[PDB]
Design a protein around this motif. Sequence first.
Motif, PDB file in Angstrom:
ATOM      1  N   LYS A   1     -37.109 -35.985  17.365  1.00 39.66           N
ATOM      2  CA  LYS A   1     -36.201 -34.876  17.089  1.00 39.66           C
ATOM      3  C   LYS A   1     -36.609 -34.131  15.825  1.00 39.66           C
TER       4      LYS A   1
ATOM      5  N   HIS B   1     -39.652 -31.937  17.033  1.00 38.25           N
ATOM      6  CA  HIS B   1     -39.159 -30.716  17.656  1.00 38.25           C
ATOM      7  C   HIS B   1     -38.462 -29.786  16.673  1.00 38.25           C
ATOM      8  N   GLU B   2     -37.907 -30.316  15.587  1.00 40.61           N
ATOM      9  CA  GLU B   2     -37.312 -29.510  14.533  1.00 40.61           C
ATOM     10  C   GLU B   2     -38.354 -28.725  13.746  1.00 40.61           C
TER      11      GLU B   2
ATOM     12  N   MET C   1     -30.256 -33.895  11.880  1.00 41.13           N
ATOM     13  CA  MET C   1     -30.498 -35.216  12.456  1.00 41.13           C
ATOM     14  C   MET C   1     -30.933 -36.226  11.402  1.00 41.13           C
TER      15      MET C   1
ATOM     16  N   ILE D   1     -23.793 -13.532   2.623  1.00 41.51           N
ATOM     17  CA  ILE D   1     -23.929 -13.644   4.069  1.00 41.51           C
ATOM     18  C   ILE D   1     -22.521 -13.868   4.618  1.00 41.51           C
ATOM     19  N   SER D   2     -22.216 -13.204   5.729  1.00 41.48           N
ATOM     20  CA  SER D   2     -20.834 -13.047   6.162  1.00 41.48           C
ATOM     21  C   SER D   2     -20.506 -14.039   7.267  1.00 41.48           C
ATOM     22  N   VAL D   3     -19.458 -14.827   7.053  1.00 44.55           N
ATOM     23  CA  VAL D   3     -18.787 -15.543   8.129  1.00 44.55           C
ATOM     24  C   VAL D   3     -17.491 -14.748   8.275  1.00 44.55           C
ATOM     25  N   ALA D   4     -16.680 -15.042   9.295  1.00 42.59           N
ATOM     26  CA  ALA D   4     -15.541 -14.196   9.649  1.00 42.59           C
ATOM     27  C   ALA D   4     -14.465 -14.173   8.564  1.00 42.59           C
ATOM     28  N   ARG D   5     -13.979 -15.341   8.150  1.00 41.91           N
ATOM     29  CA  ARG D   5     -12.887 -15.400   7.188  1.00 41.91           C
ATOM     30  C   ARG D   5     -13.322 -15.834   5.793  1.00 41.91           C
TER      31      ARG D   5
ATOM     32  N   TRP E   1     -29.273 -10.332   8.116  1.00 40.44           N
ATOM     33  CA  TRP E   1     -28.223  -9.378   7.805  1.00 40.44           C
ATOM     34  C   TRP E   1     -27.752  -9.622   6.379  1.00 40.44           C
TER      35      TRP E   1
ATOM     36  N   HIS F   1     -17.495 -25.921  13.238  1.00 41.14           N
ATOM     37  CA  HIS F   1     -16.592 -26.383  12.182  1.00 41.14           C
ATOM     38  C   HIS F   1     -15.660 -27.458  12.722  1.00 41.14           C
TER      39      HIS F   1
ATOM     40  N   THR G   1     -12.206 -14.426  14.253  1.00 43.03           N
ATOM     41  CA  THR G   1     -12.895 -13.219  13.828  1.00 43.03           C
ATOM     42  C   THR G   1     -12.025 -11.972  13.936  1.00 43.03           C
TER      43      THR G   1
ATOM     44  N   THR H   1     -17.038  -7.341  13.715  1.00 44.78           N
ATOM     45  CA  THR H   1     -17.090  -8.308  12.637  1.00 44.78           C
ATOM     46  C   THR H   1     -18.290  -9.229  12.818  1.00 44.78           C
ATOM     47  N   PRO H   2     -19.081  -9.476  11.775  1.00 44.17           N
ATOM     48  CA  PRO H   2     -20.247 -10.348  11.930  1.00 44.17           C
ATOM     49  C   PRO H   2     -19.895 -11.799  11.659  1.00 44.17           C
ATOM     50  N   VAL H   3     -20.785 -12.686  12.089  1.00 45.56           N
ATOM     51  CA  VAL H   3     -20.717 -14.102  11.751  1.00 45.56           C
ATOM     52  C   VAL H   3     -22.145 -14.638  11.776  1.00 45.56           C
ATOM     53  N   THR H   4     -22.429 -15.619  10.922  1.00 45.22           N
ATOM     54  CA  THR H   4     -23.753 -16.215  10.803  1.00 45.22           C
ATOM     55  C   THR H   4     -23.625 -17.721  10.974  1.00 45.22           C
TER      56      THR H   4
ATOM     57  N   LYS I   1     -32.717 -28.891  23.969  1.00 43.28           N
ATOM     58  CA  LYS I   1     -33.658 -29.914  23.532  1.00 43.28           C
ATOM     59  C   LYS I   1     -33.352 -30.455  22.141  1.00 43.28           C
ATOM     60  N   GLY I   2     -32.574 -29.737  21.331  1.00 41.68           N
ATOM     61  CA  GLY I   2     -32.132 -30.241  20.048  1.00 41.68           C
ATOM     62  C   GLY I   2     -32.652 -29.509  18.828  1.00 41.68           C
ATOM     63  N   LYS I   3     -33.223 -28.320  18.991  1.00 45.79           N
ATOM     64  CA  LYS I   3     -33.751 -27.574  17.857  1.00 45.79           C
ATOM     65  C   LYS I   3     -32.704 -26.613  17.308  1.00 45.79           C
ATOM     66  N   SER I   4     -32.568 -26.589  15.982  1.00 49.44           N
ATOM     67  CA  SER I   4     -31.595 -25.731  15.321  1.00 49.44           C
ATOM     68  C   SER I   4     -32.103 -24.298  15.246  1.00 49.44           C
TER      69      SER I   4
ATOM     70  N   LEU J   1     -30.805 -20.059  14.087  1.00 45.04           N
ATOM     71  CA  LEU J   1     -29.894 -19.257  13.280  1.00 45.04           C
ATOM     72  C   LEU J   1     -29.482 -18.019  14.064  1.00 45.04           C
TER      73      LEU J   1
ATOM     74  N   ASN K   1     -27.043 -14.529  14.283  1.00 43.78           N
ATOM     75  CA  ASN K   1     -26.229 -13.502  13.649  1.00 43.78           C
ATOM     76  C   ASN K   1     -25.472 -12.761  14.748  1.00 43.78           C
ATOM     77  N   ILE K   2     -24.215 -13.136  14.958  1.00 43.50           N
ATOM     78  CA  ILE K   2     -23.426 -12.683  16.097  1.00 43.50           C
ATOM     79  C   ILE K   2     -22.439 -11.627  15.623  1.00 43.50           C
ATOM     80  N   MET K   3     -22.492 -10.450  16.240  1.00 41.39           N
ATOM     81  CA  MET K   3     -21.585  -9.349  15.932  1.00 41.39           C
ATOM     82  C   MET K   3     -20.568  -9.222  17.060  1.00 41.39           C
TER      83      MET K   3
ATOM     84  N   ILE L   1     -28.505  -2.480  14.505  1.00 42.27           N
ATOM     85  CA  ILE L   1     -29.048  -3.562  13.691  1.00 42.27           C
ATOM     86  C   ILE L   1     -29.283  -4.847  14.473  1.00 42.27           C
TER      87      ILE L   1
END
Lengths: 111, 82, 74, 306, 73, 75, 104, 77, 75, 98
Positions: free
Chosen positions: B6, B9-10, B80, F8-12, F25, I4, I18, I34-37, I44-47, I49, I51-53, I71
Amino acid sequence: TPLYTDNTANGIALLWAPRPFNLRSGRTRRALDIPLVKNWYREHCPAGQPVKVRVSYQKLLKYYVLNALKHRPPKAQKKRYLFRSFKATKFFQSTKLDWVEVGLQVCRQGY
Amino acid sequence: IGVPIKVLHEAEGHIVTCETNTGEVYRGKLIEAEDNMNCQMSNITVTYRDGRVAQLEQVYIRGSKIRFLILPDMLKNAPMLK
Amino acid sequence: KAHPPELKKFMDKKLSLKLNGGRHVQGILRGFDPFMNLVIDECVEMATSGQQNNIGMVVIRGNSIIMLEALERV
Amino acid sequence: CSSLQAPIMLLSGHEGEVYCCKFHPNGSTLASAGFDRLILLWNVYGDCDNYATLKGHSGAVMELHYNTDGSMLFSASTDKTVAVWDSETGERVKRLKGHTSFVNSCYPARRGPQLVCTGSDDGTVKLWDIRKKAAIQTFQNTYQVLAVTFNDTSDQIISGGIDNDIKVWDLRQNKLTYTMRGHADSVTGLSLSSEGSYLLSNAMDNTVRVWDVRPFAPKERCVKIFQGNVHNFEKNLLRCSWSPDGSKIAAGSADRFVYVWDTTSRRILYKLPGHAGSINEVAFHPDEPIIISASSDKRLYMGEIQ
Amino acid sequence: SSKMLQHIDYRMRCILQDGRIFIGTFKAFDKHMNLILCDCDEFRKREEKRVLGLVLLRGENLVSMTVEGPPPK
Amino acid sequence: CTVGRLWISVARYHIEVNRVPAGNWVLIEGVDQPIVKTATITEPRGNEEAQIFRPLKFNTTSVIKIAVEPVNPSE
Amino acid sequence: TYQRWQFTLPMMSTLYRLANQLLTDLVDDNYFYLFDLKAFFTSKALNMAIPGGPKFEPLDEDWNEFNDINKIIIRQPIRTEYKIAFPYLYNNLPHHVHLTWYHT
Amino acid sequence: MVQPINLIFRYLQNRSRIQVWLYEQVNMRIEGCIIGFDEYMNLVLDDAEEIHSKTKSRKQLGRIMLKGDNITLLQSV
Amino acid sequence: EQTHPEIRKRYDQDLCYTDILFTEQERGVGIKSTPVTVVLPDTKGKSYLFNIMDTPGHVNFSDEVTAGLRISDGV
Amino acid sequence: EMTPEELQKREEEEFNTGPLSVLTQSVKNNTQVLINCRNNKKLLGRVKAFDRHCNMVLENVKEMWTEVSKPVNKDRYISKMFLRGDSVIVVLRNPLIA
RNA sequence: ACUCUGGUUUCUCUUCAGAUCGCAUAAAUCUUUCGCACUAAAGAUUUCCGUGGAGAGGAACAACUCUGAGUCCAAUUUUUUGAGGCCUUGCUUUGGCAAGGCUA
């Protein structure tokens, strides 16, 4: 497992039931705090009704809007028990009576 | 599956540097990796045992011949490993 | 449990393989198995002597494979 | 002065008697408990506040004890149980429930594994590894035991009781090895030094003894006899403590006087007033020469001896 | 396999099949003895310190491990 | 202008940082005074051939006219 | 003490079937549109009357350049529910109105 | 696509002059004529012969059973 | 709620994490994009990032989508 | 494997008519064994038991290897050993000298 | 798969609660606004119907459901091997180490 059982359609129909028929658990309510007429004058006026019934709908809705607007949360206080302080007094006794007999006793004591 | 796979893959998409059993050091951006250590890498600086530096643009390494890999340092805050 | 190696990016490309005793070979990849045995067309030998010898359609067992090198752009 | 805190300053807040008082071995906090079923955690320095409270005893707390780690607090209670607490946030991490009568004593194993040798009014001296949640070994004394303690090695238990003799039990031989005879009434309080060679003894013959619990045997272990102490009609469990330098002993007395002797001189160094009832336990601060004293007067007296 | 769950975050030495020395913080392992070691230093024999970073060591080239130092704060 | 803070913006809630690289962003404090609809942020020194980006081409045309006045003409 | 209750689902089906005469057939809050508590509070604050709604007691403008009826195109008559549904577009001095729900 | 086991099957169909390489052995190679394989790629050779790199002395082997854990390359002629 | 642990929905009401304006709560519709990050894992388990508007879906606020699509790269 | 059964007793039929049965005679008749192992060592002794991996337990063994100077063979005595099975060239029953 | 906590019900006492404390809706006092105030709006204060959190005491039976805690892989890809021997150079901690060229 099968696709549908006997309790499937009833279980779906209870999902869109009004309060509290969409619930399955809750607390009890004292019997004078359950209005049974509230939806009836809350919905609308039916067609073909006379004048005074429409005025009665509008005045009952006026009282409901006034009670909704004048509502404020109650003030915090110590919990209140009159009969628990009456019970510790030796001048009072407890028993079990029929409703009609105690209803006659209350009115003759008032007389 | 285990924990180091893991982490492998990271570290995809980043620049890793791997040494295999033939003593050769391959540094470049890790494109793809699997459960086993078959590593597809690109834009590779190649160090031999004697010291020649080569530029090989697509390398695919079998996981059997690998001694070890060297990963980027910011993976200590990866989820992880916490 | 043995998954096949993701070699779809390198199909029908010109790659050079390294083998165990400092060996080198070249040719076109034509397919694989989940044990990474490789079929190579137009296989030229290219040993450490420096002289080139074409063979043809050959099979390399995966256990001696050290590295692939894509000469062609993928 | 020769400390960091104030003079004779008092600790009020215990709602009933205080049967046991112990210092945290780092020396900045403090534990006192008694008839309240309620342990109070004080600060030694500063304004001497009560920063934490431990509830979870259904009866009075007979013996408080601290390991040298100081993080977990051991508490033998009257009901049937010995509770194990933590000292920072203060929740009972464990109950120890194997005694069939009033548990008079407990003791921490401080060097090796965390063993809690306890004694109770049934006569059973029970040892308690905390990861077992059960009784490891039960040494069956025929009479009541009022004070139990480990040695420095934590491989013997030293139980003092009402059988007029102090009895040591080996953890590997599982027998009584020798009987320290020479008391004429119930032995109520046993405490052992930091260097672990000597062991204090209080009993209702109104005398204090020092024994030498050690493998080197002098064949008559009653080396030092101390007087001045008294035990009264109240018949409490009059406890004991050693100074961390080993120079002074302190045995709680029934005549409201905090007693502190010298070990070498065998004379009463300190006879301190202020308490109103029988003094159950008197303790010593680890670093500085400070003395707290616990008595039946619902109060504690901190104080700079030197 | 709790003997390797006890070795977590310890500063440990690792001996390879080649005789080289990997001294690193024991972060992660698996059943194939693949090591994840952070802030690794390599010692070889002439002695020299070679900083590596995050090392994913394959189990086929590891012989024996030992413990050198306590975990940092 | 001078950049005050960067978030960097989260909602609240907003997470304050001190640098933002390319591709992300960004929430910028302290440049709001010349901005009307959109803006382009460049360097003061160098970058002399910098041109602006296109304005927003909306999907519709606003046709509803409303007229406003204050109640008190002094305000 | 008879304080909390929990039932099974066929029992709730039966109690919902027997009480069908007292319960309305409503399924959503697309009903009560401009006939709910927030619209009633808006009609209270603006001293108007919803058709079918209640009446309330109240909680003289000159000709300006602004209210010129020669500038106003009168095409369809504007009613009170237009003022109640959109409290800030058609209202002068909208003091204590409440914003109603839009749509479910 | 061609997988290598079907090409070994085509080799035993064609009875070609298979030259097999070896793991860790860069000098000593074996010519042969393949007959059959298995799941672990063990290979029998009809007329096998041994060829070195510095010596090159062709000695007769016969029908051999060369193991799977030793071979490297299956080339023709 | 996936990112969260301490933020959960009420049993009877929608969360609208939001929707931070008072008009967006009283009307029940979206008004401002409204944005959120966030950081999300794949299969497969890969992180990764993101940026959702969140853009409002009402037609008259279509201009809030055009400012959101200037944007971004994907819809 | 085409035999996924729980009652797997082919590994002792492996020990009776298979190749590994060479060791089981040295389990039963208790014969002397000679072992050539990977760093050029010769181990002569008596094996007690083993498994399908040939992880053997031996007792009262003498093991030899040569050193180079020019190669002279040295020997040493060991009372008891455990030998992992991948670290062998060959295992040998010593013949009947008589 | 082996053991130790935590029970449920009912009655009483003491504290906190602007949380739709109550998915229902009363009465009194004072001020202001108009009628000429039950047919009337706003603000402030107070009284009654009775409720949720916490703690303490009592006594009717069940004691380990639940909540926890202490307690089948040797044949490529990792753990059942391509392993060991030769030569040259720098230092020899004269044991041999590092690099390179080899045979297997």
